[PDB]
Amino acid sequence: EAPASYVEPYLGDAIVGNRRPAVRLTLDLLDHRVPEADIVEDLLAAAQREVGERWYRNELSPADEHLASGVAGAALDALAAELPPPTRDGLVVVACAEGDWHSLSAQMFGETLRASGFDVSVLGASTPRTAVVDFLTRAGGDSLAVSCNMPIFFPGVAQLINAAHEIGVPVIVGGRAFGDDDRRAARLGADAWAAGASEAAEILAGWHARRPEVGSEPAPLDGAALRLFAASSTLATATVDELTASPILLDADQVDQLREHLVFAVQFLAAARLVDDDSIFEDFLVWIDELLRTRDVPREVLAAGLEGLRAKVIAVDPGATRLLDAA
Amino acid sequence: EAPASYVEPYLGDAIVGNRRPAVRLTLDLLDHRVPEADIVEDLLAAAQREVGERWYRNELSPADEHLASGVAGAALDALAAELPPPTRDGLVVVACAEGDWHSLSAQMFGETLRASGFDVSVLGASTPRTAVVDFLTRAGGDSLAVSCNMPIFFPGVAQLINAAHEIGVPVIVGGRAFGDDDRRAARLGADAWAAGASEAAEILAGWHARRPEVGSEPAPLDGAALRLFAASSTLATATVDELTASPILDADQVDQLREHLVFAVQFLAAARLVDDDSIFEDFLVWIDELLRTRDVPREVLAAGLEGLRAKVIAVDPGATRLLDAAW
Ligand code: B12
Ligand code: B12
Ligand SMILES: C[C@H]1O[C@@H](n2cnc3c(N)ncnc32)[C@H](O)[C@@H]1O
Ligand SMILES: C[C@H]1O[C@@H](n2cnc3c(N)ncnc32)[C@H](O)[C@@H]1O
């Protein structure tokens, strides 16, 4: 009867898109007086993480996950239909980072907030920066919460924080890209960071009660790190052109997968540099290496790919040299 | 009253993210014995299109639409929780086209089918080709329904049809990209085409009962049209490099223009692929009026198209006449 112990039966149904028994479990816990926050964190988010890990281990496909993610959204919808109305005044706007389509991160977070009596509008997946600030303005938002699932979205989170400051609004950030403490968040000028709803509820309720001062001076970022971000396309696509004159010829699917991986590589590298945390790049190499290992595609390809990136990457950002000379 | 007459009050709530009253309308109609299909088509789909048009007229932002789209998803979820189990055997797999993220087209369609007693798995937004086919295989899907909201996704729908054929599975297609008849669909090798669920229900129920022959011959397509598809990024990004030596732009504007030019080459390529000029002509009309309501001078796009000319015809000389048609 702990939410955690229901992950397996939930997944059994969720992975094949069998919504009804899986949302029934969700609602049975709720009716047995389990706090919603726990249901969301310990069952739904935990299940979704396991889906992601199975995909990652090449034990599931995107088709399975798509179904699992729909069931998760249906569970959140069911839960939301049980909620009493907001007890707190002051609208919190929850947004995925621009470029980020993990709507469910924003939605799970925002729903946990709702369950603490917050008035919450979840934009979910990627919205233009200027459209988010304009929404804050029109909807009289107290606070912006930005949910970021990969560190490759950081440049835009920084820009978004800046735009929000220009209109007086404070930004809390979170989700897995920001790690287990506030160092990455602080490096981008976020007014706050938290790991989950419990803490964010304190910060947000505090921003409602006492609307804090916000810089309006943009947080300093390494320009070379940003130029390396901007160039990720060019470097990847140009790396893949050479290589296929012809040191590995690769079908149209394989060339696109490689190209896509190398764009990601340069973006993790740029992100590591931007917020001065080497582990972002090192964790990516570990991550991708094992992604490919379960998929029986020789890693001479990616090695060759990284090899190719070397000369052009350092031409843009020489400070990335040292990051590359571990791998 | 009729579902159609509730569009305006539905939107009033949906566009500001006020889920509960808007989902309640959908459930009130259902309690008043209104068929689900009608609710979905006449209220939900109708509202979502009007959201689209307000966005298009620059009267709404993507932030407001994201709210409206969440409400629509929650409405479908509520309605789905009222359905009895399937009365029909034989699994229909509903997928957005690869590259297409309009999950709600697939979901609205699939849900109308469910309401006719079909067993349905909605993959929704973009899934890799080989993951869709592997799902069909593992789940023993009778039929694939592909939902396509832009004609720039056609090459991959063709590939997908081909993969489905290799495993003996028939494909119906639909969604707004396929127009008012079956000509575009047929040109890509689809085994059938329909406007909505009512017709597709007849075709699908017929495929369950009498399992049809499927061509293990790929539908013929012009390679130059495909090479022009493949090159869209290169041509756009390279067109925008020239033009900014310097005929006129901030980092936002350069990216918007670049993105519009990738679209231009893809609508052009799509028009060529299925031999329907109107795909490209409709796009020019569409984009021209998109920008007009946004007060961004159309000298820029003109100049952009102008720039594409030399490279585009170098790849596909058969596009020349389509380009000179315009201005
Ligand atoms: C489903 C899923 C997707 C779905 C999302 C669908 C949807 N509607 O959301 C789709 C299909 C879009 C997808 C696409 C991709 N994703 Co994905 N996928 C996931 C999965 C399984 C997450 C789904 C989810 O439900 N998240 C919601 C829950 C589980 O998140 P949470 O972190 O528990 O949220 C809590 C806390 O973070 C906190 N919190 C969250 N936000 C905020 C905000 C604030 C302010 C605060 C205080 C707190 C807070 O509170 C929440 C309380 O519940 C994960 C697995 C994972 N996250 O471990 C990946 C994962 C994030 N995806 C991944 C990848 C790689 C991809 C793709 C690049 C794959 C590809 N296409 O080739 C794309 C990128 C798309 C993009 N640009 O955003 C990787 C990232 C790996 C890495 N960084 O090295 C992951 C980790 C999977 C993996 N490898 O294990 N993905
Ligand atoms: C909401 C929305 C989005 C959302 C969708 C979120 C979601 N689905 O969860 C998001 C934000 C993802 C989005 C993004 C974009 N979209 Co959009 N947006 C829409 C909108 C408003 C979709 C509304 C929706 O709910 N669709 C479901 C309903 C309304 O669809 P329906 O067509 O009635 O479906 C029925 C029939 O077609 C049929 N049917 C449907 N599928 C199938 C399949 C089969 C097999 C059969 C037999 C029948 C069938 O039965 C259905 C049920 O009755 C439309 C507006 C519109 N459709 O006119 C655009 C629209 C499709 N989007 C558009 C654009 C431009 C974009 C973006 C390019 C914006 C951008 N990046 O700049 C991107 C493209 C993303 C991509 N696909 O890769 C344009 C396309 C323009 C064009 N020239 O083709 C539209 C038309 C808006 C407009 N009026 O300009 N979009
Ligand atoms: C992180 C999640 O993204 C999904 N995923 C991985 N690659 C793609 C893709 N090309 N398109 C759509 N979804 C994808 C998987 O289901 C994984 O679990
Ligand atoms: C076609 C639909 O897509 C949304 N839309 C338009 N541009 C973007 C973008 N850059 N990011 C996300 N959504 C967008 C609008 O809400 C519109 O209605």
Residue numbers in the entry:
A (entry chain B): 2 to 246, 249 to 252, 254 to 331
B (entry chain A): 2 to 246, 249 to 251, 254 to 332
Provide the publication's sentences verbatim.
Here we identify and characterise a sub-family of multi-centre photoreceptors, termed photocobilins, that use B12 and biliverdin (BV) to sense light across the visible spectrum. Crystal structures reveal close juxtaposition of the B12 and BV chromophores, an arrangement that facilitates optical coupling. Light-triggered conversion of the B12 affects quaternary structure, in turn leading to light-activation of associated enzyme domains.
Despite the low sequence identity (~34%), the structures of the two photocobilin proteins are similar, with an RMSD value of 1.63 Å for 464 C-alphas after structural alignment. Both the SasPcob and AbPcob proteins contain the W-(10)x-EH and E/DxH motifs in the B12-binding domain, which is found in other light dependent CarH-like B12 photoreceptors. The D ring is positioned out of the ABC plane by approximately 40° due to close interactions with Trp296. The crystal structure of AbPcob revealed that steric hindrance by this His residue interferes with BV binding, unlike in SasPcob. Molecular dynamics simulations and ligand docking demonstrate that rearrangement of surrounding residues could allow BV to bind with AbPcob in certain conformations, where hydrophobic interactions with residues in the binding pocket (e.g., Leu252, Trp289, Leu294, Arg297, Val299 and Val303) contribute to retain BV in the correct orientation. The lack of the main binding interaction with the Asp residue in AbPcob may explain the absence of any obvious spectral shift and increase in absorbance at 700 nm upon BV binding that is observed for SasPcob. These findings could explain the lower BV occupancy levels for AbPcob whilst retaining the ability to respond to red light. The weaker binding and lower occupancy levels (~20%) of BV in AbDPcob suggest that evolutionary pressures may have reduced the requirement for BV and resulted in a different role for the globin-like domain in these more complex fusion proteins.
